[PDB]
Design a protein around this ligand. Sequence first.
Ligand SMILES: Cc1cc(C)c(Nc2ccn(C)n2)c(C)c1
Ligand SMILES: [Zn+2]
Length: 140
Amino acid sequence: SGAIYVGNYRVVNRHLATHNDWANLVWEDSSRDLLVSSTTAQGCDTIARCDCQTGVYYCSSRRKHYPVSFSKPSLIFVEASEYYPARYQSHLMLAVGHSEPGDCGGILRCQHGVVGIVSTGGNGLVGFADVRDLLWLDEE
Ligand SMILES: Cc1cc(C)c(Nc2ccn(C)n2)c(C)c1
Ligand SMILES: [Zn+2]
């Protein structure tokens, strides 16, 4: 589990969104595994606006933050899980790292701010849903 709290927005994995998230929906995209809902309080996370390929992510199944190198956001085939059938997921970045289903929501960050959240995993790989192209998170 985990979310990004920026301005009056809450960014979560779409497959982990709650009824309150759907009842206060701002935007959702199944192909990206992302859902954004509105919040009453303002959040403290800052979104990175950059092309970094090195950063650090939080892995709840190890209670540790790991430094990683990660690929550029791309269209990647992801195998079937309990949340999605086998399909192409867009704006996804991969790194070598430990991940379990419950690690989804962990933040990946670089020197500029939050880059994305854990969304996929298995066999020593971890995939992150990018949020750096969602410029509207910084306003309104
Ligand atoms: C972060 C994360 C997410 C998921 C859903 C998974 N399990 C599975 C099982 C089959 N897939 C394709 N994925 C793992 C290991 C890690
Ligand atoms: Zn950066």
